[PDB]
Amino acid sequence: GAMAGSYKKIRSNVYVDVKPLSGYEATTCNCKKPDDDTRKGCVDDCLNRMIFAECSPNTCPCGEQCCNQRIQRHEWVQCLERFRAEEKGWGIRTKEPLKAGQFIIEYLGEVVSEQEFRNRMIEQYHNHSDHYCLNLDSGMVIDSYRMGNEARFINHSCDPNCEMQKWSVNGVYRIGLYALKDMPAGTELTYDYNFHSFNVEKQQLCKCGFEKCRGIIGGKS
Ligand SMILES: NC(=S)c1cccc(-c2cn(C3CCN(S(=O)(=O)C(F)(F)F)CC3)c3cc(CNC(=O)C4CNC4)ccc23)c1
Ligand SMILES: C[S@@+](CC[C@H](N)C(=O)[O-])C[C@H]1O[C@@H](n2cnc3c(N)ncnc32)[C@H](O)[C@@H]1O
Ligand SMILES: [Zn+2]
Ligand SMILES: [Zn+2]
Ligand SMILES: [Zn+2]
């Protein structure tokens, strides 16, 4: 059998019975390429960035200086580490400081319909002690119970320091983890499962440690 905590490490999402087409392809924005090519273009006022669409490289006026292609250019931070998080199994911490708003990592897994996921829950997952299912869009989820990347080890917090964002990238929706606030070296990354995770209808104590803790992962106040 498989070893405890085993999972298949994948490089990008695996489309099972659905593909999360966004219906949109970004075209040329109104940005101007900086003449100093060490300076980023397509910053906060990029019209594609403002609709959570990453630029398309054949049409972006900033070319290699575009900083609105973070997911497709795989611009993950390289300082993440899996560690033993007290009373929360494995967690993920950043070894170096992060800043509010920063892109951290793409969340990967198997893209499945809610129908397929419910089938997998009945047949396999119902008695697991750890769960791995992120929301995505209407009728579909990212299932990282079997396949994914190290983002699957990020724990829930009732006072999170990161969030998920859904972006249109090359015609498909993809999910990135972004910092909500500055974080010093050593910080465990967390996000709010109530906002970003699929309701797997499982009942688990929250050990996030905050005074505002809801007591249950994904629970109400
Ligand atoms: N996905 C992962 S990894 C994961 C891992 C562990 C728990 C949950 C998780 C659990 N729940 C509830 C199940 C019933 N419990 S309960 O304690 O049994 C009792 F008794 F009923 F209160 C209360 C908590 C959730 C509720 C929501 C609500 N969000 C949504 O539905 C989306 C937001 N847009 C709509 C989101 C995630 C969860 C998800
Ligand atoms: C997406 S996995 C996170 C990685 C997991 N800790 C592990 O060891 O592989 C979600 C599971 O981690 C545990 N977990 C996540 N956040 C937690 C928290 N705040 N308190 C206690 N357990 C938590 C729960 O068992 C949950 O089903
Ligand atoms: Zn732009
Ligand atoms: Zn651009
Ligand atoms: Zn909590």
Numbering used by the authors: 2063 to 2283
Question: What is the paper's account of this structure, in its own sentences?
Answer:
At the molecular level, ASH1L is a large, ~3000 amino acid protein that contains a catalytic SET domain responsible for the transfer of a methyl group from the S-adenosyl methionine (SAM) cofactor to the lysine substrate. While ASH1L represents an attractive drug target, developing ASH1L inhibitors is challenging, as the catalytic SET domain adapts an inactive conformation with autoinhibitory loop blocking the access to the active site. At the molecular level, ASH1L maintains the H3K36me2 mark, which enables the recruitment of the MLL1 protein complex to chromatin to activate target gene expression in leukemia cells. The crystal structures of ASH1L-inhibitor complexes reveal compound binding to the autoinhibitory loop region in the SET domain.
Thus, we designed two further analogs of AS-6 by introducing 1-(trifluoromethylsulfonyl) piperidine moiety at the indole nitrogen and azetidine or methyl-azetidine rings at position six of the indole, yielding AS-85 (clogP = 3.4, tPSA = 108) and AS-99 (clogP = 4.1, tPSA = 99), respectively. Importantly, both compounds are potent ASH1L inhibitors (IC50 of 0.60 and 0.79 µM for AS-85 and AS-99, respectively), and strongly bind to the ASH1L SET domain, with the Kd values of 0.78 and 0.89 µM, respectively, Fig. 4a, b and Supplementary Fig. 5a. To understand how optimized inhibitors bind to ASH1L, we determined the crystal structure of the wild-type ASH1L in complex with AS-85 (1.69 Å resolution) and found well defined electron density of the ligand. Overall, the binding mode of AS-85 is very similar to AS-5, and the common core structure occupies the same site on ASH1L. The piperidine moiety at indole nitrogen fits into a ledge formed by the side chains of E2263, Q2265, and I2278 as well as the backbone of the C-terminal residues G2280 and G2281. The positively charged azetidine ring of AS-85 forms favorable contacts with the helix dipole from the short helical fragment encompassing residues from N2254 to H2258 and a water-mediated hydrogen bond with F2257. In addition, the amide group in the linker extending from the indole ring at position six is involved in a hydrogen bond with the backbone carbonyl of N2256 and a water-mediated hydrogen bond with N2261. An intriguing feature of this class of ASH1L inhibitors is the presence of a thioamide group, which forms a unique network of interactions, including the chalcogen bond between the sulfur in thioamide and the backbone carbonyl of H2193. Structural studies demonstrate that the inhibitors we developed bind to a site adjacent to the autoinhibitory loop in the SET domain, possibly stabilizing the conformation in this region and allosterically blocking the enzymatic activity of ASH1L.
